[PDB]
């Protein structure tokens, strides 16, 4: 019962207090789920029904004998609704002796990792076994825009913004997106394209752009899954994702504990299923750095 | 075995059983007694 | 996580 410093003379009585809840590193949760159209669906798929054209109007005269007019043609886009599974192996001796609620801790961590891993699928995911992201959707230059493609505007120089005038590719990217989509439109960038945009400055050395970190009055989603500024990359996207990108999912995290296969362990198999591609091709424009 | 915090934990053993057969033989004795002796003696040889 | 033997897991 002497000092607490040395362990032998009464230093084993002090029993350090552990944390209340096991913490963690806090990775990026900006996942495009808060800007897109999430639809609950208990099926194999989801079929949005959009209108790729519009009708016609007459201005009928007083004695005109009004004939037929157009009626829009309608596109069905199939959300494949793939599944996302993770299965960590946990020891039964840990779970019986490890006073933190390890089952719901793994549940929180699997839900965090699924919300983080479906973001990369929402952004640059391909066709197979995962949602096809909006970057992998057969880009066609704006002005020559048809329905089966996403538009882009190009900056000029190959690996950077335009040399003579900068902040112009960004502003005609904004004003080449459509009038109603810009009511709630957002930029999507990553954390080192946003840095390169904020580093731009005028001829005097003052950076020319004025907690959501909005750009020109439009909000910015700092993703981590768009590419950075490469030779032909699409680093900055912009548009109405609440009408453009349709996420289809099941709002549950199905956990099955598997005490039998890995016999001294517990082997929690947890899997939610979530899908989605672009629903409205006009609602998203991109920034290509080519020419 | 005990256990390893990281192990395969294979199937350990099972008692191999044995059947012992009690054959249950018979034990028999057949003494021959004369029909003269069994009648003419005073002693009950049939119960002796 | 995994096993209770090795400390870091």
DSSP assignment of A122-172? HHH--STTS---TTSS----TTS--TTS-EEEE-SSSSSS-SSS-SHHHHH
Could you give the 3-state DSSP secondary structure of residue B33?
coil
For residue B36, give every residue at least 6 positions away whose Cβ sits within 8 Å of its Cβ, in sequence order, or none.
Answer: none
- Chain C neighbours (≥3 Cβ pairs under 8 A) are A, B
Three-state SS string over A66-135 comes to CCCCCCCCEEEEEECCCEEEECCCCEHHHHHHCCCCHHHHHHHHHHHHHHHHHHHHHHHCCCCCCCCCCC
The length of chain B is: 48
- The whole-angstrom separation of Cα A118 and Cα A225 is 10
- Give the span between the Cα atoms of A291 and A235, in whole angstroms: 14
As a whole number of angstroms, the distance between CA A97 and CA A95 comes to 6
CB contact under 8 A, C4 and A89: no
CB atoms within 10 A of CB A77: 16
Name which of A281, A283, A31 is nearest A138 in CA terms. Answer: A281
Which residues in chain A have Cβ-Cβ distances shorter than 8 Å to B9?
263-264
> What value, to the nearest 5°, has the Cα angle with vertex A124 and ends A123 and A126?
125
Sorted by sequence, the CB contacts under 8 Å of residue A39 that are 6+ apart come out as A46, A246, A247, A248, A249
SS3 A279: coil
| Residue C1: closest CA among B5, A271, A255 | B5
Q: Which residue has the tokens 């335009």?
A: A162
Number of H helices and E strands in chain B, helices first, is 1, 0
User: In whole angstroms, what is the distance from residue A135 CA to residue A122 CA?
Assistant: 9
Residues A234, A223 contacting (CB under 8 angstroms): no
CA distance A31 to A43: 23
The C-alpha torsion from A7 through A13 and A16 to A17, rounded to 10°, is: 180
Q: Strand, helix or coil at A275?
A: strand
Instruction: Find out whether A150 and A285 touch, Cβ atoms under 8 Å.
Output: yes
Q: In A, residues 234-263, which contact B (CB 8 Å cutoff)?
A: 263
Resolution in A: 3.6
Q: Is B20 on the interface with A (CB under 8 A)?
A: no
Contact list in A for residue C1 (CB cut-off 8 A) is: 88, 90, 94, 102
Q: Smallest Cα–Cα separation from C8: which of A2, A94, A248?
A: A94
Report yes or no: B9 at the A interface, CB cutoff 8 Å.
Answer: yes
- Chain A interface test: which of B1, B2, B4, B9 (most A C-beta within 10 Å): B9
- Is residue A248 within 8 A of residue A46, CB to CB? The reply is yes
Residues of chain A found within 8 Å of residue C8, distances taken between Cβ atoms: none
């Amino acid at each position: 019962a002497l000092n607490s410093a040395v362990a032998a003379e009464g230093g084993y009585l002090v029993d350090p207090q552990t944390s209340e809840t096991i913490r963690g590193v806090l990775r990026s949760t900006a996942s495009l789920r808060q800007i897109a159209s999430v639809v609950n669906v208990e099926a194999t798929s989801f079929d949005v029904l959009v209108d790729k054209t519009d009708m016609g109007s007459g201005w009928a005269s007083e004695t005109a004998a009004l004939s037929e007019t157009a009626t829009p043609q309608i596109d069905r886009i199939t959300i494949p609704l793939h599944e996302l599974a993770a299965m960590p192996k946990a020891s039964q001796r840990l779970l019986d002796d490890s006073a933190f609620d390890i089952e719901t801790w793994l549940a929180n961590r699997i839900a965090d990792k699924f919300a983080r891993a479906e973001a990369a699928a929402f952004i640059s995911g391909d066709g197979v076994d995962k949602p096809t992201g909006f970057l992998t959707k057969t880009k066609v230059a704006n002005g020559a825009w048809a329905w089966g493609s996403l538009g882009y505007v190009a900056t000029g120089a190959a690996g950077d913004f335009a040399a003579v005038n900068a902040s112009d590719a960004v502003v005609d990217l904004v004003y080449a997106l459509g009038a109603e989509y810009r009511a709630n439109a957002s930029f999507v960038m990553n954390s080192k394209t946003a840095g390169a945009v904020r580093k731009m400055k005028d001829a005097d050395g003052r950076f020319l752009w004025a907690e959501p970190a909005r750009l020109m009055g439009y909000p910015v989603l700092i993703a981590e899954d768009m590419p950075d500024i490469a030779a032909n990359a699409y680093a900055i996207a912009f548009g109405d994702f609440g009408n453009g990108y349709t996420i289809a999912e099941r709002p549950d995290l199905r956990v099955l504990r598997d005490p039998f296969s890995a016999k001294p362990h517990v082997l929690f198999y947890a899997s939610k299923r979530v899908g989605g591609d672009v629903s409205d091709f006009a609602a998203i424009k991109l920034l290509k750095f080519a020419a």
